[PDB]
């Protein structure tokens, strides 16, 4: 095509469309020509770049600080050969429809910041090296389709040329910007405002699928304040990121042969178990740091606080990490019900003096009162909508709920909101921050006497500001109920909204000791496949049906996620029913699906690898209970080629038969939207011993 | 040329509602808008609404913000404005009044109706 | 938002009189302020658009003037029928403020 074909009766043109999909958008479209010549700084991708960023000073900055419409897009999109698109989609909520054309304004503002600001010789060395690192790194692909990707560079671009396609910055060009700035202007705009809506309203009809919409067009007045309103004020361009990683010269491994996370350093404060990278020699190092604290438990409110404290400290820094976001290289702030965790993730280059800025900024941490209140109230609204959730997803609450040593309700939590006052949380952060702990984790291709400086600053920076002192170690309490071990327990709790049903009966072993862990997999899955045979497919109940273990705690457990209105004895006595179908069906299972069954759980078991990420999660698993057996992989295989038939046999009739001793069996009910009982939860957690505790590593 | 026939704006009480229909003829609200003032008798002036028949974009001033309602049938070129929660210190003429096309050009007026919210 | 100070408020000058006016900005504004006329007990009028720009119909004896942000309307000559409360504007998205008022009195 060597003419535009956006021939002139669409530039300055609204057209309001309903779609066919729920949805709500809005286009801002240039036809741009072919400038893939045009690859040495490639201009519409760096405006992919530039209009894509969100950042300090930023127009959606900003808009989020005015609180409209929440994301958008806009950057180099293939129109077709000559020429290119520029498409500009945002997101819609209601509340942008009569702000419309200022939030055009604001991204004229924007366009007018950029253009006062003109070319940025940082912003392409930056996406340089980030292009350089990214196309240096790219790990992998699935091979189909692929080829036909790079097959579709391989037109445009020759047998050289096709895997450094547009993966590399040449020669920065100030002057293509000032070419697309001429291209990017406002009597260069195609409107498309996407609103379902105006059905029976719009008119002008599209040839094939039969869709109306309409011209409808902006009058001059508004037009020329686009035009006059160059102008410039709370809008600020970002600036260099303080970091970028170079270290990439990977560093062998040293005289340390063990292949796993080693305990390197432990002090009052200091917990380092600590490991160097030996399979895939990647320069990422990925950290995890718990923040225990008694504080923890305390109350519902000072839930909220902790919880809504991390919320808004991670939302808050987020306008510091966009650079971060910008740099692929994540992290991660998580609470726990004994306290916080922290992650972060990427390249071992800057990690530490980042680390220590994010360290700082939230140990010094200043506090705004309305936006905060915004927030309050936000998650107000959620754990009104709480309510309304599923009886899975509150079946699993069940599973955090009656579990426990003890817990709050969510209805303790729904009058503990109008408690809550800013001061408070305010006082009680120094509160707080003078006593809790961080254990260190380590992994990476990383030193030693190195990282042992890190953690130090870090800590050391972390009394410096707030004094943390440490605790006692009975002051790292854990939190389960004591069963008569054969008496069936349940309570029932009516929904409000959903009208499905949810059922489950639980069965704790014990420990994770390697008895009771193929005791529990194995058990779980050779159930599993004849429930997957006659229960989902032959019955067909409800489509939420499921069977799995439960891992928290360092106990083990059984779960059976069921969801559907039925009677609940009714129900409770199909779930028997397959109770005694595996009952018989096991003692019918020969030797030939049993050999079988156990292959399919040792390639369960059995995965290689594949990142520092999947390892670390199950390391943290190692964590969390404070085990670390590294190598019970081999060793529960081998107590695997233990079990006989006769010896599940022995599992089944000391704690799974009707009159077992070892009985451990518990239901909890859920009713409709409309033995012996549970008299109440005080009851359930009156009367009571308690448990052995797992030994630690 | 350009017809600013307002009607509409008559009785109401304080804390009251009306809607507007004013006869905005001769040209396109499809083009540029009208809009509309506040002047109490004795008083000085602010803008009460904007109505954007071709893009839907409802502006209101802050104490009024949300709770009107404003339409214009474009079709016709006929504004309206659904006036509601309307209390007692709002007895004012309220101007349709045309915004042409320039950087701050409100030339063209209606005699406006003193919308009256007396006792 | 901005507010807007019609500077004088009021005025007393005979027919043939040279008479500025200036609305007071209360911050840094551009060109979107006009200028008004309201004969009272009638509807208003613009004198000028674009804040130097004479509308059609408005005689030439009125020369708004873009002065620094304090913008000033200039009246060239007072007439007999120019005895009128007169205003301004500021348009933005922002809140538009007006003139305070400002009525043509005669010297006698």
């Known amino acids: 095509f060597p003419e535009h074909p956006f021939q002139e009766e669409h530039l300055k043109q609204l057209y309001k469309i309903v779609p066919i999909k729920d949805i709500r958008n809005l286009y801002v479209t240039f036809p741009i020509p072919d400038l893939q010549k045009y690859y040495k700084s490639n201009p519409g991708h760096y405006l992919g770049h530039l209009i894509g960023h969100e950042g300090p000073g930023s127009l959606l900055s900003e808009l989020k600080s005015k609180g409209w419409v929440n994301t958008l897009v806009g950057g180099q999109k293939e129109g077709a050969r000559g020429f290119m698109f520029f498409i500009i989609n945002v997101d819609l909520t209601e509340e942008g429809l009569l702000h419309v054309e200022d939030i055009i304004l604001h991204m004229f503002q924007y366009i007018q910041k950029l253009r006062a600001e003109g070319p940025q010789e940082w912003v392409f060395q930056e996406l340089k090296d980030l292009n350089a690192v990214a196309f240096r790194f790219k790990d992998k692909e699935r091979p189909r389709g692929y080829t036909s990707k790079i097959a579709g560079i391989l037109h445009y671009y020759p047998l050289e040329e096709v895997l450094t396609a547009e993966y590399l910055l040449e020669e920065f060009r100030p002057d293509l910007i000032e070419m697309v700035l001429d291209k990017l202007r406002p009597e260069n705009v195609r409107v498309a405002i996407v609103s379902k809506s105006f059905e029976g309203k719009t008119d002008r009809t599209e040839e094939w699928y039969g869709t109306q919409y309409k011209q409808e067009a902006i009058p001059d007045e508004v037009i020329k304040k686009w035009q006059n309103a160059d102008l410039n004020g709370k809008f600020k361009l970002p600036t260099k990121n303080e970091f970028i990683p170079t270290n990439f010269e990977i560093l062998p491994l040293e005289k340390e042969a063990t292949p796993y996370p080693a305990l390197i350093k432990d002090t009052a404060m200091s917990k380092l178990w600590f490991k160097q990278d030996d399979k895939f020699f990647l320069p990422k190092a990925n950290l995890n740091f718990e923040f225990f604290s008694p504080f923890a438990y305390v109350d519902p409110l000072h839930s909220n606080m902790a919880y809504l404290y991390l919320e808004l400290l991670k939302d808050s820094l987020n306008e510091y990490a966009y650079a971060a976001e910008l740099a692929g290289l994540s992290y991660d702030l998580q609470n726990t019900i004994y306290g916080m965790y922290l992650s972060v993730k990427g390249y071992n280059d800057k990690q530490p003096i980042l680390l220590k800025k994010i360290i700082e900024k939230m140990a010094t941490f200043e506090i705004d009162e309305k936006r905060f209140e915004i927030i309050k109230e936000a998650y107000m609204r959620s754990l009104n909508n709480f309510r309304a959730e599923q009886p899975h997803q509150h079946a699993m609450y069940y599973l955090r709920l009656l579990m426990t040593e003890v817990a709050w309700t969510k209805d303790e939590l729904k009058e503990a909101l109008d408690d809550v006052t800013l001061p408070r949380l305010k006082a009680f952060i120094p509160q707080l921050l003078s006593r809790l702990h961080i254990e260190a984790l380590l992994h990476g291709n990383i030193t030693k006497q190195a990282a042992l400086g890190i953690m130090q600053m870090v800590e050391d920076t972390l009394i410096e500001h707030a004094h943390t002192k440490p605790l006692l170690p009975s002051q790292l309490v854990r939190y389960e109920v004591q069963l008569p071990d054969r008496g069936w327990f349940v309570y029932q709790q009516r929904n409000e909204v959903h009208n499905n049903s949810g059922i489950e009966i639980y069965y704790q072993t014990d420990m994770q000791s390697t008895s009771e862990n193929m005791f529990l997999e194995l058990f779980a899955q050779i159930i599993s496949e004849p429930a997957f045979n006659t229960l989902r497919t032959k019955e067909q109940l409800g489509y939420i049906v499921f069977s799995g273990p439960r891992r928290a705690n360092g106990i083990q457990g059984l779960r059976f996620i069921i969801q559907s209105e039925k009677p609940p004895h009714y129900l409770e006595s199909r779930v028997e029913a397959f109770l005694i179908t595996m009952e018989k069906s096991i003692e019918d299972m020969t030797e030939e699906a049993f050999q079988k069954h156990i292959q399919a759980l040792a390639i369960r078991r059995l995965d290689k690898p594949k990142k520092l990420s999947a390892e670390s999660a199950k390391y943290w698993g190692e964590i969390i209970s404070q085990q670390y057996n590294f190598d019970r992989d081999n060793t529960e295989v081998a107590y695997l080629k233990t079990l006989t038939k006769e010896d599940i046999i022995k599992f089944y009739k000391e704690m799974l038969a009707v009159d077992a001793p070892r009985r451990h069996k518990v239901s909890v009910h859920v009713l409709a939207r409309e033995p012996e009982v549970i008299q109440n939860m005080t009851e359930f957690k009156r009367g009571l011993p308690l448990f052995p505790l797992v030994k630690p590593h | 040329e350009v017809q600013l026939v307002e009607s509409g704006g008559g009785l109401v009480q304080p804390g009251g509602s009306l809607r507007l229909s004013c006869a905005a003829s001769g040209f396109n609200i499809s083009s540029s808008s009208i809009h509309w003032v506040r002047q109490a008798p004795g008083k000085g002036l602010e803008w009460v609404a904007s109505?954007?028949?071709?893009?839907?974009?409802?502006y209101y001033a802050d104490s009024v913000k949300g709770r009107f309602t404003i339409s214009a049938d474009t079709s016709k070129n006929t504004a309206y404005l659904q006036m509601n929660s309307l209390r007692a210190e709002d007895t004012a003429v309220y101007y349709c009044?045309?915004?042409?096309?320039?950087?701050?050009?409100?030339?063209?007026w209606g005699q406006g109706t003193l919308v009256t919210v007396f006792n | 938002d901005i507010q807007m100070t019609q500077s004088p408020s009021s005025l007393s000058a005979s027919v043939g009189d040279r008479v500025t006016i200036t609305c007071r900005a209360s911050?840094?504004?551009?060109?979107?302020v006009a200028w008004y006329q309201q004969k009272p007990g009638k509807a208003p009028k613009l004198l000028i658009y674009?804040?130097?720009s004479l509308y059609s119909g408005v005689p030439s004896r009125f020369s708004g003037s873009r002065s620094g942000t304090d913008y000033t309307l200039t009246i060239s000559s007072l007439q007999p029928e120019d005895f009128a409360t007169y205003y301004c504007?500021?348009?933005?998205?922002?809140?538009?403020?007006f003139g305070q008022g400002t009525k043509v009195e005669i010297k006698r």
């Open positions: 504007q500021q348009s933005y998205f922002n809140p538009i403020t």
């Open positions: 009044a045309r915004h042409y096309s320039a950087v701050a050009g409100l030339d063209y």
């Open positions: 911050q840094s504004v551009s060109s979107a």
């Open positions: 674009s804040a130097s």
């Open positions: 109505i954007y028949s071709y893009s839907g974009s409802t």
